Symmetry: D2
Amino acid sequence: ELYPGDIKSVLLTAEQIQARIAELGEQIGNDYRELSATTGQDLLLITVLKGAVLFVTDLARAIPVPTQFEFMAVSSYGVVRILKDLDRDIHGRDVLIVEDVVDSGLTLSWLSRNLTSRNPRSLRVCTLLRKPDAVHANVEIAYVGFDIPNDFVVGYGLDYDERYRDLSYIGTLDPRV
Amino acid sequence: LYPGDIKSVLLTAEQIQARIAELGEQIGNDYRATTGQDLLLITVLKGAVLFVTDLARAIPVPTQFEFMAVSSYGGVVRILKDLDRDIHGRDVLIVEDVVDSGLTLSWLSRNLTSRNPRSLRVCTLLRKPDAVHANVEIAYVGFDIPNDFVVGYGLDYDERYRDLSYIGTLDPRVY
Amino acid sequence: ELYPGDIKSVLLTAEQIQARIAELGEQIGNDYRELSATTGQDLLLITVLKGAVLFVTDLARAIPVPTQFEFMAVSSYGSGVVRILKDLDRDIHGRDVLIVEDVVDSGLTLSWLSRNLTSRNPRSLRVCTLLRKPDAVHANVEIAYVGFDIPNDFVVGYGLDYDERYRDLSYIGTLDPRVYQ
Amino acid sequence: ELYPGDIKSVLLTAEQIQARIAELGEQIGNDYRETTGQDLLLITVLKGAVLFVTDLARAIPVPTQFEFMAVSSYGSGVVRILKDLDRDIHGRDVLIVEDVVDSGLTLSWLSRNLTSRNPRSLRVCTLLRKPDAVHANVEIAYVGFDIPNDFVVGYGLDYDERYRDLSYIGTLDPRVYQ
Ligand SMILES: O=c1[nH]cnc2c1ncn2[C@@H]1CNC[C@@H]1OCP(=O)(O)O
Ligand SMILES: O=c1[nH]cnc2c1ncn2[C@@H]1CNC[C@@H]1OCP(=O)(O)O
Ligand SMILES: O=c1[nH]cnc2c1ncn2[C@@H]1CNC[C@@H]1OCP(=O)(O)O
Ligand SMILES: O=c1[nH]cnc2c1ncn2[C@@H]1CNC[C@@H]1OCP(=O)(O)O
Ligand SMILES: [Mg+2]
Ligand SMILES: [Mg+2]
Ligand SMILES: [Mg+2]
Ligand SMILES: [Mg+2]
Ligand SMILES: [Mg+2]
Ligand SMILES: [Mg+2]
Ligand SMILES: [Mg+2]
Ligand SMILES: [Mg+2]
């Protein structure tokens, strides 16, 4: 065990995650199958740094169609500041936003509006985890991995002060941390 | 995924994960309470994002993530995205996908050491024969491969073939 | 001289520039003097690197109301389609913002910048350019403050450049074709 | 008056500021007039020294170019790069243009960072210098003024992103930065 005592409870084991991603990729693959030959360009996965890097690497390999990578680095104004923009113009591209968790959905709403103004051919959202407050915002999420309670969790990219990211499983963090 | 593009398979997906399992265990034993700070993996976007996610899960000690985005001018690169936190007194492990000319690695090494980390080592999945010409000490190497252009497992040709679980050799007709 | 054999003719002398900016300053000052003390926040000047840098410095010192500085570094993906190299430092939400440009011709980047800043929901958004080319006279992006209506000549000076040169010129002149060939 | 009751006193008027910059410009020009074919490269860190660099470049008789860097802070010369140079300064004559040097920790980093890019020549020009920078480890060949340790604003200098547009440099009243 990496963090003894810090993990209060195990929410999603590594077995659950990889199995869900396996069938998530198949679903995404089935939907974007008539686009690798109907258009001419591969599915574009856009990921916000950095908690969703573990998920996007497993997902891209789980999707049975060719996929490309694009990353974004953002920070909150203390509406978010762009620390690192995309490398390519996503005009006429099939873009799939890949998130790790959607709670308030504020940044997701911003990102959705920001990418759509770049005029993609298509634009959908895929997240590994969805929290109850994501009902209050509504950005249409076509691909949801898991619906979980409103408890702070870590593991599989998810963090608390840049820690617990390297966990293969997703568990609930102990409040004493 | 890419019918007719891949000529042959250099490293299968099973062999990659098996070696990464070895690397993590090796890295884990070397970096294993005194500091009170976790191991810090610094990765240059974006061909080594697949390798660092598997490696970090293969390392039996707590590891953190830091990413950098760079671009070429025109040995010297442009920082498009710097680190999020100060690596002062931190055990930094640079994670690369492949080292060939090693000019960017040389630049990155000098750049990070000026930030004064506690330690600084380099781990790469692949190493090409002309890495000897680059004066950068690499503590952890996954595979020594020929100079032939390869794709897969993060490696790309015009932003493609990154999603391949294996590392294959591209057909020169494509390149 | 600084660039002999390069500058063919002076389109706008140094004197004509300082005289027009002073006039622009008071005009902007009067229009924003109300909202200045009413909202309690200063006028926000947003400038895109790096041509309009010289212009925004002289302009802000010409406006008789307190003005703040803000910069944004951008790049082109391909030919408007714009990549952000350096985003703004603070929130634009609920701020009186005046876009400060050096010159507008195609207006592609300006159209992008306008649409982008409006998404941040400013209290007010207007554009001020030092120079305007014929193809930008009847654009969709409204510009309330135009310094000069210059012809379609490729000009350098006062921030303007060709291959990162002639920026330091105190005046604006028509560059010789022998240079940009 | 832009700010009626905020400026305690005027340290440097607009007249004596532009007079010094004119002197600096000629001094820089006569030094860099001496063959390479490449112009003098001015490097400025946002945002304070953006007013000084525009006036200085127009005060320097030799052709000068513009390069800008934007930096932030981690904790702290520990520093983050938000906007790197968009040009390679290899074998270039680089002059760092600063607004004020106090602790000089940022300047120390900027020196080490730029020198690793291997410029032809690297020098520093600052408009203002505070007592704890007079005998700093980084050499500054061009100093406009040596001012006291008092917190000043104006001519690019700021407090909470204000007072930058002032044509003069004045001392802020303790009421403001309390
Ligand atoms: O349980 C968590 N573990 C790790 N990180 C979490 C958790 N819940 C929220 N987050 C983070 C907090 N900042 C982004 C992310 O929230 C998603 P959103 O922008 O839709 O509110
Ligand atoms: O076989 C390859 N497949 C995919 N990418 C490759 C390959 N060989 C080189 N590269 C890239 C080329 N640019 C960075 C990287 O080279 C490593 P270095 O910076 O040490 O020279
Ligand atoms: O006469 C010129 N001198 C110096 N630069 C010029 C000139 N005309 C255009 N430009 C540039 C071209 N790219 C940005 C700037 O024009 C603004 P826009 O995006 O509206 O075309
Ligand atoms: O009197 C001032 N008015 C406005 N800004 C000031 C003043 N003194 C310092 N500064 C700023 C504070 N951050 C950078 C600069 O300090 C100089 P350094 O980083 O070399 O110690
Ligand atoms: Mg996320
Ligand atoms: Mg987080
Ligand atoms: Mg790499
Ligand atoms: Mg590549
Ligand atoms: Mg402009
Ligand atoms: Mg230009
Ligand atoms: Mg400064
Ligand atoms: Mg300041």
